[PDB]
Design a protein around this ligand. Structure first.
Ligand code: MG
Ligand code: MG
Ligand code: MG
Ligand code: MG
Ligand code: MG
Ligand code: MG
Ligand code: MG
Ligand code: MG
Ligand code: MG
Ligand code: MG
Ligand code: MG
Ligand code: MG
Ligand code: MG
Ligand code: MG
Ligand code: MG
Ligand code: MG
Ligand code: MG
Ligand code: MG
Ligand code: MG
Ligand code: MG
Ligand code: MG
Ligand code: MG
Ligand code: MG
Ligand code: MG
Ligand code: MG
Ligand code: MG
Ligand code: MG
Ligand code: MG
Ligand code: MG
Ligand code: MG
Ligand code: MG
Ligand code: MG
Ligand code: MG
Ligand code: MG
Ligand code: MG
Ligand code: MG
Ligand code: MG
Ligand code: MG
Ligand code: MG
Ligand code: MG
Ligand code: MG
Ligand code: MG
Ligand code: MG
Ligand code: MG
Ligand code: MG
Ligand code: MG
Ligand code: MG
Ligand code: MG
Ligand code: MG
Ligand code: MG
Ligand code: MG
Ligand code: MG
Ligand code: MG
Ligand code: MG
Ligand code: MG
Ligand code: MG
Ligand code: MG
Ligand code: MG
Ligand code: MG
Ligand code: MG
Ligand code: MG
Ligand code: MG
Ligand code: MG
Ligand code: MG
Ligand code: MG
Ligand code: MG
Ligand code: MG
Ligand code: MG
Ligand code: MG
Ligand code: MG
Ligand code: MG
Ligand code: MG
Ligand code: MG
Ligand code: MG
Ligand code: MG
Ligand code: MG
Ligand code: MG
Ligand code: MG
Ligand code: MG
Ligand code: MG
Ligand code: MG
Ligand code: MG
Ligand code: MG
Ligand code: MG
Ligand code: MG
Ligand code: MG
Ligand code: MG
Ligand code: MG
Ligand code: MG
Ligand code: MG
Ligand code: MG
Ligand code: MG
Ligand code: MG
Ligand code: MG
Ligand code: MG
Ligand code: MG
Ligand code: MG
Ligand code: MG
Ligand code: MG
Ligand code: MG
Ligand code: MG
Ligand code: MG
Ligand code: MG
Ligand code: MG
Ligand code: MG
Ligand code: MG
Ligand code: MG
Ligand code: MG
Ligand code: MG
Ligand code: MG
Ligand code: MG
Ligand code: MG
Ligand code: MG
Ligand code: MG
Ligand code: MG
Ligand code: MG
Ligand code: MG
Ligand code: MG
Ligand code: MG
Ligand code: MG
Ligand code: MG
Ligand code: MG
Ligand code: MG
Ligand code: MG
Ligand code: MG
Ligand code: MG
Ligand code: MG
Ligand code: MG
Ligand code: MG
Ligand code: MG
Ligand code: MG
Ligand code: MG
Ligand code: MG
Ligand code: MG
Ligand code: MG
Ligand code: MG
Ligand code: MG
Ligand code: MG
Ligand code: MG
Ligand code: MG
Ligand code: MG
Ligand code: MG
Ligand code: MG
Ligand code: MG
Ligand code: MG
Ligand code: MG
Ligand code: MG
Ligand code: MG
Ligand code: MG
Ligand code: MG
Ligand code: MG
Ligand code: MG
Ligand code: MG
Ligand code: MG
Ligand code: MG
Ligand code: MG
Ligand code: MG
Ligand code: MG
Ligand code: MG
Ligand code: MG
Ligand code: MG
Ligand code: MG
Ligand code: MG
Ligand code: MG
Ligand code: MG
Ligand code: MG
Ligand code: MG
Ligand code: MG
Ligand code: MG
Ligand code: MG
Ligand code: MG
Ligand code: MG
Ligand code: MG
Ligand code: MG
Ligand code: MG
Ligand code: MG
Length: 185
RNA sequence: GGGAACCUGGGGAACUGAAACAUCUCAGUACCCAGAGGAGAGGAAAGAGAAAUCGACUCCCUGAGUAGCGGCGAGCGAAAGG
RNA sequence: GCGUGCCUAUUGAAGCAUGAGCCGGCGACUCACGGUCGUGGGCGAGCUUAAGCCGUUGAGGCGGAGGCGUAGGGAAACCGAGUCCGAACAGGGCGCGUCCGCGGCCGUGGACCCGAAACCGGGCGAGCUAGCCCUGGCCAGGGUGAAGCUGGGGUGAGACCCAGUGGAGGCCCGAACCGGUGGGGGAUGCAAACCCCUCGGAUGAGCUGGGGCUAGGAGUGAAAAGCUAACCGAGCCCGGAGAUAGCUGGUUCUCCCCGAAAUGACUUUAGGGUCAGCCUCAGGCGCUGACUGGGGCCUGUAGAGCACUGAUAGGGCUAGGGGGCGCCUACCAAACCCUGUCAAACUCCGAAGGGUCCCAGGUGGAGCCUGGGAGUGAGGGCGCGAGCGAUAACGUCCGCGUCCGAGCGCGGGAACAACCGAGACCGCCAGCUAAGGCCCCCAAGUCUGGGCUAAGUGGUAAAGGAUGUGGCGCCGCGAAGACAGCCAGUCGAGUGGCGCCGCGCCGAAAAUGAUCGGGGCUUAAGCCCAGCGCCGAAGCUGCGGGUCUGGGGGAUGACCCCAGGCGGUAGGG
RNA sequence: ACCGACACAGGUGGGCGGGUGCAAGAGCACUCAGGCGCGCGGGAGAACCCUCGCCAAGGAACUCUGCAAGUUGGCCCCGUAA
RNA sequence: ACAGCUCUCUGCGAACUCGUAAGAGGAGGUAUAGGGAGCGACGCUUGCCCGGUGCCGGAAGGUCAAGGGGAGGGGUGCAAGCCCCGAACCGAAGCCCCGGUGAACGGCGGCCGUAACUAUAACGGUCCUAAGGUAGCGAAAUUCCUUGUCGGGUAAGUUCCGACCUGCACGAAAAGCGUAACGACCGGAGCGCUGUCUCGGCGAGGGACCCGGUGAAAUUGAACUGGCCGUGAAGAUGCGGCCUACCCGUGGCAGGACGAAAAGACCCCGUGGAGCUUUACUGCAGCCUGGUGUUGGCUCUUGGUCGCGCCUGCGUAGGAUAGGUGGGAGCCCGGUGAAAUACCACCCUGGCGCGGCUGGGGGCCUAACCCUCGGAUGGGGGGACAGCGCUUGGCGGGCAGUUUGACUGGGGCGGUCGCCUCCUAAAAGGUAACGGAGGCGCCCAAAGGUCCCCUCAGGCGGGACGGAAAUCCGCCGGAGAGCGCAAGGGUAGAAGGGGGCCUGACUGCGAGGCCUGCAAGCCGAGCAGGGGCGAAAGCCGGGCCUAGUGAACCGGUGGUCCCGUGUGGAAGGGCCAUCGAUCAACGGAUAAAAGUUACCCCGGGGAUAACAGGCUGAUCUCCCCCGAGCGUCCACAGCGGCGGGGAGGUUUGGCACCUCGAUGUCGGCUCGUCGCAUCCUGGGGCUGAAGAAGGUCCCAAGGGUUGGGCUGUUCGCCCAUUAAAGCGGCACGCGAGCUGGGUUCAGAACGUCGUGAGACAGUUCGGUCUCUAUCCGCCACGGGCGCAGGAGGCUUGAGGGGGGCUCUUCCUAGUACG
């Protein structure tokens, strides 16, 4: 309706496009010495792919492994029933109310199968935003042309978007930016 | 054919002014062409204009910046009669 | 010792804004006809003549056509000291010189003087340059080797293939010839388009000699708005023409008097103008002026205040509403109540002030009236009060005021339009004072008592730190003699604690060489509270002199006394 | 001696335009016939500039850019890809 | 430009062009040709949308200018008359309307939902359209984010090439995608070779310099012309305090004299100027078009129409095809109906019958006009047409003259432009800003006059339908209701709520004020005239009150007395009443008007922008306070919430004070110099310091602070090293020292917007950078004099300047610590 609520409907409409970015990184075979790499998992349970960060508690004991202290025995049961079913290629455990799964890093060829695809979400992410800028500015057009402004009352708008788009595009380049280390280094 | 201007006919601007500008103005000016000559034109009423009047024409002074004309603006502007 | 050129334009210039090498000459508010005034004469209920006519050879008459003036009022008819609107016989609106000379200003003409970009007419150019027509030349040498023909090959006949001859082409290489790619030079040149190296085309849409043709809103153009006689978005010359310029510049002798504005209103107006405001001169009226005292009103700001309007933190009381809902539990939460507050657009209340009317003082480059001449209509700083700004700006708009402008004349402030003092006729080798100062530069107290400060603070900064120092307080409570060390007695006294006042330290880094104006100051040459004295300006007295008004001498003699004003740009006299 | 304000480093159509050598030629070099030595000179031997010759090693690090400069260059003969 | 493609025009006296015309090109041509337009060999191709626009086609209708036409009206004369307006209706072109048309101007979308991992969406629903971009191409001479991501080339590649397509904003004849051959065209690589460079050196010639001859120019207030901190109109040789410094030159260097040269080219202002554009205004040329003059014959055929002759009207009964009103009875009523006939009439309805006056059409003609033919007194063909005169209406950037407002913290854009109500506003008024927050361009025949009465809003209880208000009753409540609508003031002792009569919401006027520059606006006593209500004293010339509106000019309607061009009356004026304005840019230039320039010009300005300086310091970089809370314990080893205080003038800004008769504007090169907040190397302090390393704070600039790739880049980003590869000041130092890659002149193109000419803080290739230094300053080298005799030598050094760096390794010692 106006720049006021708009400049915020971008910092809200760009948020999500960023969201997924994080999402598509953890789903990646990093040093896999992290728990979150699991919780996202849509685990089929009681008739609904239910995110693991809701069916249990994953926390890697040490670097070399993770534990899913799955409260209810049964839950844990139908849990493995999905952490493996991921092409990845791991194997957990039916030990106690928890799930012991190893973390085995691998070859360089495994680095391209991980690093290359990342410098790909690097795009899907930067871009998803690029559009929240394209689609933004356009409503900024019809806006000050409906509402009346100055060729400058508008530039202020026009570039603010830009400073916002740029501000958010950072929480991306710079985001994955770190995990790239957890992957590489 | 020529002739310093001066005169008549045939054509004929704009800048300007109106504090813009198109009617209007400058202006029938400038200039162009023809023609007449010591001058040229005009000249004996199919006039004038309200006076039982006047009596070819042309020039001067008044009439008069009047009567009027006018995007009733800028501005233009007679005639009878004396 | 003291001292920032001249003009110009400006809120403001020495200005690092404008113009000017220097000297001499030329060089800009005029005339004509109308108007409006003031003024010197003539004639007066009238005054005066235009063209023309007669005389003159630097004689003046005559000429009353005509023009103003004697009545105004009404759109007009018309009426008339009235008239007009009107039914009114209410009312209301309008009511007494010419002719010359001269000065001021206005209208009109180029009308203060220069200066455009352009516009319009008539002409002059294609001996440059563009296109084209006619008639003539020119293009070393080398290269590749098309079509054609001819001989052989193949076929049913062919097509088609081979050699050979042959000599095509907006073909190739490269001089002349015609261009002008890239670079350097040249840049008051060799030259207002050049030179050197380099590079393109060179039988073609080629280059060139002579003769011809098309032109100014026109030509011509392998197209750039290119070219048309070295500048072309419309050539050149001549005339209209002294186009117009709400802009820029310039605008000449002296002394005297007064002196602005930089605002309001309306402007296709906003750096212009019309009216008003403010200056000035004339004549007219004469204490009403500015300012002050005393009285009587209107008034709604500074404060303050919640009675309205609204906002407000908390607490109580209590709807209705959360959560168990039945009791209860959190002001989560309306009105109400106190408790404390907030507000340009709230005020129960309300100042000081301001304004205004009658009376009183008030003789002043006061006012009030009629009129001639204006300029100005960018303002700027500073105090105060408000907006905008960010409780920013040498910011910005307003308000009272002031000062600069125009007081850049003088002292102080180091230097400096507006900060302090203070209104500069002139002259003097006099004297006392303002502001500021009084140790040396530099005038006058290293003046006198009384403290404070040790950082050069002074000599120019904050929140906030800190037993820096000097001076006050009330608090403990130490013979129920610990406050500091050594087992606590001896030791036998000033030790803890907050918190106020003065000066001070830290906090605290900037760009060419440093500093408070310099030197140099510490019981000061700093700072605070006292006291007497000097210095110091163009301020005021002293002596003399110039000048204009006002007021008396006065025998006008313009000739001495008397009391005042005399900075000044635009401007007026 | 013509057009360029000049005794101008620019411009101006046609014919002749020798010899030797170089693949040829009106190209280049030298020189016949012929003409000229450009209407200020003399010295010195710095910076710097103009125009010109050279370089160790490196060989585009230069720079906007190999701009410039260098390399290659004639003829004969092989031999020449997409 | 080009061949070549396409659309289009043109039947010959061609179209088109020049010209007033004659005439001429066209062309001594004839559609296999000529003109106009776009595209630009050649290969494959060239989609969809005729709603709007243009053009082609439509013998019907709609509208329409003259002219024809005259029902009807007015003016005058005693009149025959003469004069005027004047409806029907017939009337071109154009426009409207109906079709067609894209190698004509042009145009060629969006929003929801859905696949058994997810994603995504072939598929569905839906909104609008004239129809929603096909082939091919794609971060491109087009891609804003952008150096998009990947891959290749490189040590390293914002460029380049290959891909992906999320095409800000390709795309089919302003052509699309390709293409061998071609280019002094623009980009990326290589190899060869070099002074281009690291990195500078030597040498040659012509100048520069010295000597003899000749001998300029721009500029120039006057000169006796130094540095620093200050200062001043805010960048000083010329003021102030201080600091230096003998006089005068020769060769050089360029930092300064805001150096010179151009009355700034950008910027704005001027109601300044030109070239251009169009669906801005207005006209002109030309073209189309009706009537006519030129201009005539003979026929065919239908109109409008006035003279006339005639026939002509079938409601229900009916003597039945009554038109109508009169006369009227021999050439009938009757009976009945709305009306009675046998007959003569005057006329509405309507058609035919011979004439007039005029019209329109379609034919043939020849003899005017035209063109032609071995030279014609004539013959061919066209033919009342064409051409030409006049007049009617329209098309008409082809051409012309012009208009395209102002304010405004430059301008443009956005906003506003008059009136009303508060505050601002400092206790009379008044009063600024693009200051804060709202209204008006009306409404009322009752909402008005006056007389007569009556009184709210809310609150609490009682109450049939009944919220928390319908309507009743009951107390209480001075004002918070109401007062037509904004706001303020006022108000119940009425302006409010209700009832009764009325139309003073009059005509004549107006003492006297308010306000005020003018002109406008504002209240209004009372007299006269005739009225309304009231018993009356009395009130009523509009509305509780301020907004609710517009000078004159020009026309329009009414009326009255005045004028009425020899006189009379008219035509037409005046006076009075009243009307036509978003003249709303609202004190109003015209009846009448938009753009554009980088093709541009003049006059002006630092009255006003961009660069730079200055003031400011929000923003900016920096350091400081308070100390939540992180640090395994523990505010400060290292950190710091929310919050607060300052410093600096390097960022982005605000202001517009110098300079617009000119202060050359990014980057690079060269030469630097200064600050410390320090990147190295020196010292030191704590450390959550073992050592070796670091972290962090404190001192401290003396000196150092590399070479490359990319980009114009500064800045970054990488490659290889380093003790380190520090930030910032000097007009973001430095163009009279160089460079011009960037950027802002003219050329061209892409995307883009625009109908257009042209435009763009978009791109892209191109594109002129001025021999002489006089003064200050600086580098060198002199002449003069001075230094109280005149000399030849050798030194003293007050004073200044140059220079100061840093790494690696080996011993100590593999020791100390571990
Ligand atoms: Mg003659
Ligand atoms: Mg005019
Ligand atoms: Mg006009
Ligand atoms: Mg005109
Ligand atoms: Mg004679
Ligand atoms: Mg005669
Ligand atoms: Mg006769
Ligand atoms: Mg005469
Ligand atoms: Mg008269
Ligand atoms: Mg006469
Ligand atoms: Mg001096
Ligand atoms: Mg002047
Ligand atoms: Mg100024
Ligand atoms: Mg000077
Ligand atoms: Mg200047
Ligand atoms: Mg000067
Ligand atoms: Mg000037
Ligand atoms: Mg001179
Ligand atoms: Mg002189
Ligand atoms: Mg007068
Ligand atoms: Mg007199
Ligand atoms: Mg006489
Ligand atoms: Mg009357
Ligand atoms: Mg001009
Ligand atoms: Mg002309
Ligand atoms: Mg001629
Ligand atoms: Mg010629
Ligand atoms: Mg010629
Ligand atoms: Mg050739
Ligand atoms: Mg050429
Ligand atoms: Mg060649
Ligand atoms: Mg010739
Ligand atoms: Mg040509
Ligand atoms: Mg062109
Ligand atoms: Mg020329
Ligand atoms: Mg004239
Ligand atoms: Mg003049
Ligand atoms: Mg004087
Ligand atoms: Mg005075
Ligand atoms: Mg105006
Ligand atoms: Mg005035
Ligand atoms: Mg106040
Ligand atoms: Mg409450
Ligand atoms: Mg309350
Ligand atoms: Mg008195
Ligand atoms: Mg007085
Ligand atoms: Mg003013
Ligand atoms: Mg001003
Ligand atoms: Mg100010
Ligand atoms: Mg003064
Ligand atoms: Mg002076
Ligand atoms: Mg001074
Ligand atoms: Mg004085
Ligand atoms: Mg002394
Ligand atoms: Mg003394
Ligand atoms: Mg003491
Ligand atoms: Mg520092
Ligand atoms: Mg000192
Ligand atoms: Mg004392
Ligand atoms: Mg005296
Ligand atoms: Mg006296
Ligand atoms: Mg005085
Ligand atoms: Mg004066
Ligand atoms: Mg005077
Ligand atoms: Mg010449
Ligand atoms: Mg010459
Ligand atoms: Mg010579
Ligand atoms: Mg010569
Ligand atoms: Mg020749
Ligand atoms: Mg040879
Ligand atoms: Mg030769
Ligand atoms: Mg010579
Ligand atoms: Mg070498
Ligand atoms: Mg070497
Ligand atoms: Mg390089
Ligand atoms: Mg480089
Ligand atoms: Mg580069
Ligand atoms: Mg390049
Ligand atoms: Mg490059
Ligand atoms: Mg080269
Ligand atoms: Mg190849
Ligand atoms: Mg092949
Ligand atoms: Mg055609
Ligand atoms: Mg012919
Ligand atoms: Mg083309
Ligand atoms: Mg095909
Ligand atoms: Mg269409
Ligand atoms: Mg159609
Ligand atoms: Mg048709
Ligand atoms: Mg007619
Ligand atoms: Mg009659
Ligand atoms: Mg028609
Ligand atoms: Mg969906
Ligand atoms: Mg499913
Ligand atoms: Mg669908
Ligand atoms: Mg679609
Ligand atoms: Mg399709
Ligand atoms: Mg593509
Ligand atoms: Mg792409
Ligand atoms: Mg790229
Ligand atoms: Mg491409
Ligand atoms: Mg883009
Ligand atoms: Mg590589
Ligand atoms: Mg695009
Ligand atoms: Mg598109
Ligand atoms: Mg198409
Ligand atoms: Mg097209
Ligand atoms: Mg292509
Ligand atoms: Mg080329
Ligand atoms: Mg070097
Ligand atoms: Mg030499
Ligand atoms: Mg200074
Ligand atoms: Mg210099
Ligand atoms: Mg000069
Ligand atoms: Mg100028
Ligand atoms: Mg100019
Ligand atoms: Mg301009
Ligand atoms: Mg012109
Ligand atoms: Mg017949
Ligand atoms: Mg008839
Ligand atoms: Mg009859
Ligand atoms: Mg019956
Ligand atoms: Mg009978
Ligand atoms: Mg009839
Ligand atoms: Mg015939
Ligand atoms: Mg015939
Ligand atoms: Mg005809
Ligand atoms: Mg035009
Ligand atoms: Mg206008
Ligand atoms: Mg502005
Ligand atoms: Mg007041
Ligand atoms: Mg007041
Ligand atoms: Mg309104
Ligand atoms: Mg009422
Ligand atoms: Mg009810
Ligand atoms: Mg209303
Ligand atoms: Mg009534
Ligand atoms: Mg009354
Ligand atoms: Mg009323
Ligand atoms: Mg008018
Ligand atoms: Mg009119
Ligand atoms: Mg008459
Ligand atoms: Mg208007
Ligand atoms: Mg106005
Ligand atoms: Mg008005
Ligand atoms: Mg008008
Ligand atoms: Mg251009
Ligand atoms: Mg040009
Ligand atoms: Mg052009
Ligand atoms: Mg031009
Ligand atoms: Mg200024
Ligand atoms: Mg600050
Ligand atoms: Mg903070
Ligand atoms: Mg602060
Ligand atoms: Mg600064
Ligand atoms: Mg400025
Ligand atoms: Mg300045
Ligand atoms: Mg000058
Ligand atoms: Mg200047
Ligand atoms: Mg320690
Ligand atoms: Mg340093
Ligand atoms: Mg660079
Ligand atoms: Mg790389
Ligand atoms: Mg620097
Ligand atoms: Mg130079
Ligand atoms: Mg320069
Ligand atoms: Mg310079
Ligand atoms: Mg460039
Ligand atoms: Mg260039
Ligand atoms: Mg460029
Ligand atoms: Mg531009
Ligand atoms: Mg377009
Ligand atoms: Mg080039
Ligand atoms: Mg220059
Ligand atoms: Mg020299
Ligand atoms: Mg030393």
């Amino acid at each position: 309706m106006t720049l006021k609520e708009l400049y915020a409907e971008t910092r809200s409409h760009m948020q999500k496009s960023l969201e997924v970015l994080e999402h598509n990184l953890a789903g990646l075979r990093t040093g896999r010495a992290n728990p979150a790499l699991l919780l996202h998992l849509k685990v089929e349970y009681y008739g609904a792919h239910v995110p693991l960060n809701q069916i249990a508690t994953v926390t890697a004991p040490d670097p070399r492994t993770l534990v899913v202290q799955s409260w209810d025995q049964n839950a844990l049961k139908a849990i493995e029933k999905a952490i493996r079913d991921s092409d990845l290629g791991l194997n957990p455990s039916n030990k106690g109310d928890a799930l012991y799964i190893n973390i085995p890093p691998l070859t360089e060829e495994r680095r391209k199968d991980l690093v290359r695809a990342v410098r790909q979400y690097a795009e899907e992410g930067r871009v998803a935003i690029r559009n929240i800028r394209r689609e933004a500015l356009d409503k900024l057009k019809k806006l000050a042309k409906e509402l009346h402004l100055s060729e400058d009352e508008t530039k202020r708008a026009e570039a603010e978007i830009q400073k916002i788009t740029d501000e958010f595009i950072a929480k991306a380049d710079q985001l994955a930016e770190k995990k790239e280390q957890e992957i590489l280094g």
